[PDB]
Amino acid sequence: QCVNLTTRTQLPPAYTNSFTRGVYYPDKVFRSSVLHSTQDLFLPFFSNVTWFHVIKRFDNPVLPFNDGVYFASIEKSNIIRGWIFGTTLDSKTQSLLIVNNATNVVIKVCEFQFCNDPFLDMESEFRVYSSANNCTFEYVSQPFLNFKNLREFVFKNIDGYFKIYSKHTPIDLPQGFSALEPLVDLPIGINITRFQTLLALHRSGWTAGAAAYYVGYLQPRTFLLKYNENGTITDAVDCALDPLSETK
Amino acid sequence: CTLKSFTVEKGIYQTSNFRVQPTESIVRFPNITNLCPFDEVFNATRFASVYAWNRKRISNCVADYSVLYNLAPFFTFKCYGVSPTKLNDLCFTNVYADSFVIRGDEVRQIAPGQTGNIADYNYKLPDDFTGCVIAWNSNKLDSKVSGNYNYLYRLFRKSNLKPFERDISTEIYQAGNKPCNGVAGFNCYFPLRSYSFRPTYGVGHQPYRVVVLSFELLHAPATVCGPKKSTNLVKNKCVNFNFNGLKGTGVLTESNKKFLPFQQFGRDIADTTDAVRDPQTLEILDITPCSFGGVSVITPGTNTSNQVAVLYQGVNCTEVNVFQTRAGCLIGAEYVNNSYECDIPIGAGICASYQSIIAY
Amino acid sequence: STECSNLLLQYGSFCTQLKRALTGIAVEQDKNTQEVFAQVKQIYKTPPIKYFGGFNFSQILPDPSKPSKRSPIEDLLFNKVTKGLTVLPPLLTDEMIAQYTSALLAGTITSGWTFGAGPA
Amino acid sequence: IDRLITGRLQSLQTYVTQQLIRAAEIRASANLAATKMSECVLGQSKRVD
Amino acid sequence: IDRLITGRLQSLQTYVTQQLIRAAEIRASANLAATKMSECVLGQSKRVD
Ligand SMILES: *[C@@H]1O[C@H](CO)[C@@H](O[C@@H]2O[C@H](CO)[C@@H](O)[C@H](O)[C@H]2NC(C)=O)[C@H](O)[C@H]1NC(C)=O
Ligand SMILES: *[C@@H]1O[C@H](CO)[C@@H](O[C@@H]2O[C@H](CO)[C@@H](O)[C@H](O)[C@H]2NC(C)=O)[C@H](O)[C@H]1NC(C)=O
Ligand SMILES: *[C@@H]1O[C@H](CO)[C@@H](O)[C@H](O)[C@H]1NC(C)=O
Ligand SMILES: *[C@@H]1O[C@H](CO)[C@@H](O)[C@H](O)[C@H]1NC(C)=O
Ligand SMILES: *[C@@H]1O[C@H](CO)[C@@H](O)[C@H](O)[C@H]1NC(C)=O
Ligand SMILES: *[C@@H]1O[C@H](CO)[C@@H](O)[C@H](O)[C@H]1NC(C)=O
Ligand SMILES: *[C@@H]1O[C@H](CO)[C@@H](O)[C@H](O)[C@H]1NC(C)=O
Ligand SMILES: *[C@@H]1O[C@H](CO)[C@@H](O)[C@H](O)[C@H]1NC(C)=O
Ligand SMILES: *[C@@H]1O[C@H](CO)[C@@H](O)[C@H](O)[C@H]1NC(C)=O
């Protein structure tokens, strides 16, 4: 089942500063009291990160995945529920679906016939896809989830491995440092070039709860990571941002 | 031998190195949980017909093939294109379990390059088939005194099947020139015939339950692995370790480091693996390397004496006339509290001389 | 790896050359310390009544209170300086080098330059 | 293994060469220090500076 | 490309090694020149030659 939403208000997407966010642990290696240089897919410091609002604003465009995606969510009441990844988003190719409904977190890899406007709607109405024919992988996991919550996620698709890095912070974007812990290593082995996030409506037509999300893109670069005595990343340096950091 | 001379002058000469050899081999991997569902494939109560053969895909679990090999009722284990011994080591992306029921005489037709009613019309195997077939007698389960008519095979088709093709059509077979029009009259036959199993048939006509495992490896990161046997964990000795495919040799000691939950192995200042987390019991172990020493020989001239002393550089005396110095462990010299001028330098204020060899 | 060592043996005496060069450097460092500090063969000691005409040498003479037997200046200097690989200890320890400096200070304070050219 | 052995052997030779050059520099400095110990501490020097 | 890189890298390491040796020689000469400037120009020297 699909439903067209025709009550949107036209507005261009906003842009803001990334500050020092988007940092994640490059690997599963413990390090203590050392500075480590990594050449990985990272988000540049103070970069131009796209800002979308949910307020009548219902922002659900489909964005190119590129080489990696940083998703920031300034969220309260858990409106944002999941993401959709793929190339063509239809039954012609194979797509990845990440959802968190009221009970459990479901990861599926199927050839979904996706709706043009997929969404979630007690919660008893699910309109994401109309069909799923060839399902090759299923994975069920733990629950991932004034504005009170900052949810930071990093998605990468390297060598057929889809890495999900996550961080939760009690709270525009705040200015500070928070390292993203690796959460899910996913064996999909499929091509991903485009993604779309999934929202939840509130019905009383429908009303959108107050939420904001940010989309940033990863580029190959070197970061200098600082590891404390307990192995927690506390500071980072972008080697290509400014000459002072390049010297560092 | 080191100095290429039969006469050695007075002094200390570094000759070789001391290495503590590995005493045992330790192999570790995670707990063998989240087993695959081979019990739902092999030990099912009811199997499908050979024309509508069941296909079960096996993904994201641990696949123990050692159960299938070690059961004696599973008589036929004809494996083609891969050895049964190396199934536990070879990892594949996906495992297809095709399950059906045939007679005794047609077990040999489940093979590459074979022909017959089953190979042409019911289940066809490719010539480049990577996987094994498993067959066992099921006369006690699949046979009744009245006769079991729940099993069907396709006797007629207009063409042979492609490999791994399932044909579930019930269209009336066209054997004559006239059109059949759906009525099984002259020269028109229903293509599906029934295997009527009874418990009193010979070995060539008793019902055989066949499960064919087909293994494939794709570009996705292969997830169907065998069970990984774990050797019991030995600490405080220089042993070989294999933690999650990370091989090495070192002494394992209890660690005070507070690893984060994702973190498995730890690196030092020089990016060498100095700490590891055991995959079965979540505890942290330091990996000190096995003791390495420079073996130096302290001797006076061969004209004077043939007595020698051995200095193990940077090695404690408890791990090799034994005296412990800051330079290392000195064996063969007696420490004398008296102080003399330095004759043979040892280090850290310690010098050796011949008067027996004394160290002071 | 034993196979690596077997392949390594084909390259000859490179390992012996490297060890010999490092051994030469190692003995050279001890020779350097011996040349700089061991210039007297008598260990001179200062008199117990350390009065030298109003001249105060407390900051450079050894401190009896300290276990290392070093001067306040020397103690400050030591405080202000902070896989197949091994580090060999120096032949002369810090205590003995401090003792040599103490002997030189005692000779130059009680005897002037006479001790360097003969008897003190 | 031949590639790894040649790379590591070249690195070790480079390290030993650097150590020899630094040892020469430190030997020169130590010779100067011994000269200062003989001429400034064990005597009075008329050499300027 | 590896053959070219190892040859060029060996050449560059050789050049740096001779540069360091020449640097040591020039440093010794400069130290001698500083000693001459201190003892011959800034004072009168009783050292013969
Ligand atoms: C919601 O709107 C979209 C956009 O127009 C519809 O998607 C198209 O539907 C027509 C139906 O004939 C197809 O021919 C097009 O190919 C669709 N476009 C794409 C990009 O897939 C969608 O069908 C609408 N939803 C419903 C329930 O009608
Ligand atoms: C020589 O110098 C030392 C240090 O400059 C003098 O020691 C000081 O003495 C005064 C009073 O006696 C104390 O208040 C200081 O704390 C002392 N300083 C140290 C570092 O000990 C010493 O008095 C001087 N004279 C003699 C004869 O030793
Ligand atoms: C971010 O991008 C928008 C257009 O994509 C641009 O107008 C804006 O100036 C950019 N931000 C900064 C800080 O340059
Ligand atoms: C959440 O999704 C899973 C997977 O489809 C489903 O089994 C479960 O019933 C869903 N929860 C609710 C409350 O419907
Ligand atoms: C995908 O689905 C279609 C129709 O459901 C089917 O014809 C096709 O064989 C399937 N392909 C795979 C690889 O499963
Ligand atoms: C993924 O798809 C895009 C377009 O759909 C294509 O340009 C790209 O080459 C594909 N990558 C792989 C690895 O198949
Ligand atoms: C590191 O952990 C210890 C206890 O495990 C704690 O006392 C200390 O404050 C921590 N350091 C930092 C920088 O968080
Ligand atoms: C692994 O299994 C053993 C039982 O053999 C159990 O004692 C241990 O707690 C298990 N470890 C984990 C992490 O489940
Ligand atoms: C089926 O039952 C037998 C009888 O005990 C058992 O040995 C075997 O492990 C079971 N599972 C399979 C897959 O054969």
Author numbering:
A (entry chain C): 14 to 68, 77 to 142, 153 to 176, 185 to 210, 215 to 247, 257 to 300
B (entry chain B): 301 to 620, 641 to 675, 691 to 695
C (entry chain C): 746 to 827, 856 to 893
D (entry chain C), E (entry chain A): 993 to 1041
Task: Quote from the publication.
The RBD mediates attachment to human cells through the ACE2 receptor and is the primary target of neutralizing antibodies. The Omicron variant has 37 mutations in the spike protein relative to the initial Wuhan-Hu-1 strain, with 15 of them present in the RBD.
Cryo-EM structural analysis of the human ACE2–Omicron spike protein complex shows strong density for ACE2 bound to the RBD of one of the protomers in the “up” position. (A) Cryo-EM map of the Omicron spike protein in complex with human ACE2 at 2.45-Å resolution after global refinement. The three protomers are colored in different shades of purple, and the density for bound ACE2 is colored in blue. Although the Omicron spike protein exhibits a measurable increase in apparent affinity for ACE2 relative to the wild-type spike protein [in agreement with a recent preprint (19)], the apparent ACE2 affinity is similar for both the Delta and Omicron variants. The Omicron variant thus appears to have evolved to selectively balance an increase in escape from neutralization with its ability to interact efficiently with ACE2.
